[PDB]
Structures are given as structure tokens and as C-alpha cells.
């Protein structure tokens, strides 16, 4: 009926979100181990690489929805878009990205991820070049709130509508329930042009994860709930695959059961 309470709880909880702990929890080993091809990191990168490798997802502008403190989700993307917008709710995350953009030593090191992306893209690109291009193509880092009908605000800086959207582990991680999730998907969809593409990666059947002091409440979603929401938002689903989280990667940082990858094209 009324979305304010749940959304308020969410915003409250994220005030405690610690980027460094979150990076360590999910992007340092064992989950950040890119050597095991059956690991989640390599699967995520592979979903992205293969999708962009079709040549079917291109344009001038791309918006990454809920970037947090991570850039891996753009490694394969960056060679297909001149203009990239990164976004996040939390200033601290936006500053994390700032540190990487300035190429500071105190910044999180993504070079393994950059290398791995070069590896599976199979074009013999060195990772320093991939990183240099991503840094050059990120044109802005913006506040965002997906619960707003205009997630970027009014008169945003972003080129709208975008040719493509990327969003990894955001919607389910900030929506108290499925209806909120659906509305969030509707909101970000207004930023995408008709015939444009959305690459959505997320947690399956997760109810909580840790980011330092912050223990965050997640709406657990299934593949089928994800498919239906995409259709409900005006997408044709081109691809929807599932990674089942291996027991050895269940580290107590969350109760994630799996990860989904969706390639969807906005009808129009």
C-alpha cells in the first residue's frame, strides 16, 4: 500500500554499509578466486563477456545501476560503449570508485578481474589497456535511488535515455519485498530506450548479507520471480541463467543460494 516504511529501513541499514568489508566479503578470495573456473567470479565475468561477444548489445551510452564499490561488472562492457554512467546510493561507495578512477594505491585492486576479462574475451588485450579504457569511458558517478520514479533525480546529468543498463546485486539487495523489487525494476526501466538492453545479475533466495557492522535484509527471489518481473516491466527475456552457489563458497557472509544472470531487451 505505502512504500515509505520498508524503504526507510533499507536506507537506515545502508548507513552502516562498509565498502571495504563488502569488497573483502565478495571480491577477495575465496569468492574472488578467479583461478577456479567453477567459481562465481569467473561465471559472472563469463556471462558478461559472452553477452557482449554477440555484438548484439551496443550503443553510445550505458548506465550501471547500483555500482557500489565495484567495477568488474563493466570490464567487458567498456569496449562497447563510449559513455558510461556509474551510480550508487552511498557517497562512501562513490568515493571508493573515485579512488579507483584516480588510479590511487589506496584503491581496491581489480587487476585480477581485469586480466581474467582479457583472458576470456580472447582478443589478447593486456589488462592495463582494458583498465585504461574503462577509466576513460566512465563519464560520471552519480547518486541514485531506485525507489524514486526518477532514480537519478530530475534533470539528471546522465544522457537519457541510455542504450543499455547494467545492474549487479542491487535491486534484490535494497527492496524489502517483491512488489518493491518490481517497482524498482519499473523505475530503472524508464532510463532505458525502447529496444535497449538490460544485463541484470543478482542473488537467488537470499534474505541477508554482511557488509561490516551492517547486516542487510534482502528479499529472497527465485529465477521465476525474476523472469516474471522482467516481462512485467516490458522486456523480452533473451537469456536467464542460474549459478548454484557451491557449499565451499558459503562463507557465512550471506545466505545466498545462487546467482542469476538475465539478458533482457526492453520492448519498443
Ligand X SMILES: Nc1ncnc2c1ncn2[C@@H]1O[C@H](CSCC[C@H](N)C(=O)O)[C@@H](O)[C@H]1O
Identify whether the C-beta of residue 105 lies closer than 8 Å to the C-beta of residue 51: no
Q: Is residue 73 involved in binding ligand X (CB under 6 A)? A: yes
Residue 209 binding partner per list a copy of itself, ligand ES2, ligand X, none, with a CB distance cut-off of 5 to 8 Å that depends on partner kind: ligand ES2
**Residues between 233 and 262 that touch ligand ES2 (CB under 6 A):** 254, 256, 259
Task: Rank residues 97 and 256 by Cβ distance to ligand ES2 and give the closer one.
Answer: 256
With CB under 6 A as the contact rule, the residue among 110, 113, 169, 263 that binds ligand ES2 is: 169
Identify whether the C-beta of residue 199 lies closer than 8 Å to the C-beta of residue 239: no
With CB under 6 A as the contact rule, the residue among 96, 121, 131, 145 that binds ligand X is: 145
254 is in an annotated binding site: yes
Q: Which three cell numbers stand for residue 19?
A: 565498502
DSSP per residue, 55-113: S-S--SEEEETT-TT--GGGTTGGGS-SEEEEEES-HHHHHHHHHHHTT-TTS---HHH
With CB under 6 A as the contact rule, the residue among 23, 34, 40, 192 that binds ligand ES2 is: 40
Q: How far is the CB of 260 from a copy of itself (least distance, A)?
A: 23
Q: Candidates 83-91, 104-112, 230-238, 243-251: pick the segment binding ligand X (CB under 6 A).
A: 83-91
Q: Which three cell numbers stand for residue 121?
A: 574475451
Q: Which three cell numbers stand for residue 113?
A: 578481474
Q: How far is the CB of 129 from a copy of itself (least distance, A)?
A: 5
Beta bridge partners of residue 265, listed in sequence order: 197, 236
With CB under 6 A as the contact rule, the residue among 62, 206, 226, 260 that binds ligand ES2 is: 206
How far is residue 99's CA from residue 251's CA, in Å, rounded to a whole number? 28
Q: Is residue 94 involved in binding ligand X (CB under 6 A)? A: no
| Binding mask of the shown chain, residues 33 to 72, with x at each position contacting ligand X by CB under 6 A | ---------------------------------xxx-x--
175 is in an annotated binding site: no
With CB under 6 A as the contact rule, the residue among 144, 173, 198, 226 that binds ligand ES2 is: 173
Identify whether the C-beta of residue 267 lies closer than 8 Å to the C-beta of residue 240: no
Contacts of 68 (CB under 8 A, 6+ apart): 19, 22, 88, 90, 93, 96, 169, 170
Q: Which three cell numbers stand for residue 147?
A: 525507489
Three-state secondary-structure class, residue 143: strand
- Specify binding-site residues for octopamine: 206, 254
Write out the residues near ligand ES2 by the rule CB under 6 A.
26, 31, 40, 44, 169, 173, 203, 206, 209, 254, 256, 259
Amino acid at each position: 500500500p505505502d512504500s515509505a516504511p520498508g524503504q526507510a529501513a533499507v536506507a537506515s541499514a545502508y548507513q552502516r554499509f562498509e565498502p571495504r568489508a563488502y569488497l573483502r566479503n565478495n571480491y577477495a578470495p575465496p569468492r574472488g578466486d578467479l583461478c577456479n573456473p567453477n567459481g562465481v567470479g569467473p561465471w559472472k565475468l563469463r556471462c558478461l563477456a559472452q553477452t557482449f561477444a554477440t555484438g548484439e548489445v551496443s550503443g553510445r551510452t550505458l548506465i550501471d545501476i547500483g555500482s557500489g564499490p565495484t567495477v568488474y561488472q563493466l570490464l567487458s562492457a567498456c569496449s562497447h560503449f563510449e559513455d558510461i554512467t556509474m551510480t550508487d546510493f552511498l557517497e562512501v561507495n562513490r568515493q571508493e570508485l573515485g579512488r579507483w578512477l584516480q588510479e590511487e594505491p589506496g584503491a581496491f585492486n581489480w587487476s585480477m578481474y581485469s586480466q581474467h576479462a582479457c583472458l576470456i574475451e580472447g582478443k589478447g588485450e593486456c589488462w592495463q589497456d582494458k583498465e585504461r579504457q574503462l577509466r576513460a569511458r566512465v563519464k560520471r558517478v552519480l547518486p541514485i535511488d531506485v525507489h524514486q520514479p526518477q532514480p537519478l533525480g530530475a534533470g539528471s546529468p546522465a544522457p537519457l535515455p541510455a542504450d543499455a543498463l547494467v545492474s549487479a546485486f542491487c535491486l534484490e539487495a535494497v527492496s524489502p519485498d517483491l512488489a518493491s523489487f518490481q517497482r524498482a525494476l519499473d523505475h530503472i526501466t524508464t532510463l532505458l530506450r525502447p529496444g535497449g538492453h538490460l544485463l541484470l545479475i543478482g542473488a537467488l533466495e537470499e534474505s541477508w548479507y554482511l557488509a561490516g557492522e551492517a547486516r542487510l535484509t534482502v528479499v529472497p527471489v527465485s529465477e521465476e520471480e525474476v523472469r516474471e518481473a522482467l516481462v512485467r516491466s516490458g522486456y523480452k527475456v533473451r537469456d536467464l541463467r542460474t549459478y548454484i552457489m557451491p557449499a565451499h563458497l558459503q562463507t557465512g557472509v550471506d545466505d545466498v543460494k545462487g546467482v542469476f544472470f538475465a539478458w533482457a531487451q526492453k520492448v519498443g
